[PDB]
Amino acid sequence: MIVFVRFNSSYGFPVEVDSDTSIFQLKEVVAKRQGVPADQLRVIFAGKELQNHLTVQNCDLEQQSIVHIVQRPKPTYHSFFVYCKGPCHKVQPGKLRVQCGTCRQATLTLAQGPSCWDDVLIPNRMSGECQSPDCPGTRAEFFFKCGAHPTSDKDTSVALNLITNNSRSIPCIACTDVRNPVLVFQCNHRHVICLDCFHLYCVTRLNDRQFVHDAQLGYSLPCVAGCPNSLIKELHHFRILGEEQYNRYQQYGAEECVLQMGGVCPRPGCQGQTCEGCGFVFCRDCKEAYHCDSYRVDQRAAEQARWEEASKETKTTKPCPRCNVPIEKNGGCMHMKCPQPQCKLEWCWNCGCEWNRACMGDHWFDV
Ligand SMILES: [Zn+2]
Ligand SMILES: [Zn+2]
Ligand SMILES: [Zn+2]
Ligand SMILES: [Zn+2]
Ligand SMILES: [Zn+2]
Ligand SMILES: [Zn+2]
Ligand SMILES: [Zn+2]
Ligand SMILES: [Zn+2]
């Protein structure tokens, strides 16, 4: 059998595999050509990952069928997750901060803090009074920081607003495993995916060249379920793939623009008929060296793997930590205050403790 193997590239090289050939042996043969540990390689066919024990007959692979390989080398409750450009260079939980937008000083006092993503992403959406002297600024300018290490106020990361604390134990749409955090799509059902599958998914589309181009916005991916009007608008979410794969994604304009012009290279490093450049000659029909002879997701997972909602019971209401009078939460803001005048405890919904900067940063609000 011939199967075309696409590995960090648009073109797929052919591999010879017998009827009983194991997915591990395929991942052994691809490891020789590419020189990488087999225990990090992941074979994906039609969107489904193939486990090592499986065989060609079980998979329902056929002649010239395309398989991708992708390489993969009380606790703090975190609402916010960011991409830290350094030193981490990977997605991390972040701290949510605010400042006076008029003077750029982190002293902006909020009557009531933020309740959701729109409150902290839409500029000039919130308001307060700044504690700078001779500063009139009322504008709340929210920013984020990586939480994996200390950071100067100035050193800010971008929030990945789709990445969500899986506090509802929602299973993945791709793998059915309950992970944390998870990416939640902006389709009608708010479909949930784990970040391991988001990676697998983004990479598979890069090799396939199945990215979508929002003309004004750029190139993106919709929900994995194919849902309409679910393109990821916040394109910094592709930073999650890491630099190799992000870098690849950025080069998609170049490569599509060349595709539209009628251009075509099949090297792993990089008028009607030689790479010059890299220096490697090849056929244009089959992409071989110079010499031309010789996608769905399951419905049951899709129903379960939605952000959806929880019907209120018992989450809905909690007694005041100090005085015990029931308080029900309004919106997603964790910052509770007590109307009982002999008490008036400001506390955190989630932690059950007095309100403070840690709760604020880790989870001023929750989704
Ligand atoms: Zn960091
Ligand atoms: Zn100010
Ligand atoms: Zn998954
Ligand atoms: Zn969806
Ligand atoms: Zn080349
Ligand atoms: Zn050829
Ligand atoms: Zn109270
Ligand atoms: Zn808290």
Numbering used by the authors: 1 to 73, 140 to 330, 332 to 337, 345 to 347, 351 to 353, 359 to 373, 377 to 379, 391 to 410, ...
Could you pull the original sentences from the published paper?
Parkin is a member of the RBR (RING-in-between-RING) ligase family, which uses a RING/HECT hybrid mechanism to transfer ubiquitin from an E2 enzyme to a substrate via a thioester intermediate (Wenzel et al, 2011). Crystal structures of full-length Parkin (Trempe et al, 2013) and the C-terminal domains (Riley et al, 2013; Trempe et al, 2013; Wauer & Komander, 2013) showed that under basal conditions, the protein adopts a closed conformation where multiple intramolecular interactions inhibit key sites that are required for ubiquitin transfer.
The length of this linker varies significantly between different species, so we designed a version lacking its least conserved section spanning residues 86–130 (Δ86–130 Parkin; Fig1A). This version of Parkin was crystallized and its structure was determined at a resolution of 2.54 Å (Fig1B). Intramolecular interactions between RING0 and RING2 block Cys431 in the catalytic site, and the E2-binding site is occluded by the Ubl domain and linker between the IBR and RING2 domains (Fig1B). The Ubl domain mainly interacts with helix 261–274 of the RING1 domain (Fig1E). Arg6 and His68 form hydrogen bonds with Asp274, a residue located at the end of the helix and preceding Arg275, a frequent mutation site in familial PD (R275W). The first and best-ordered site is on RING1 opposite the Ubl-binding surface and formed by Arg305 and Tyr312 (Fig1C). Ser65 of the Ubl domain, which is phosphorylated by PINK1 (Shiba-Fukushima et al, 2012; Kazlauskaite et al, 2014a), faces the disordered residues 382–391 preceding the REP helix and is located within only 12 Å from RING1 (Fig1B).
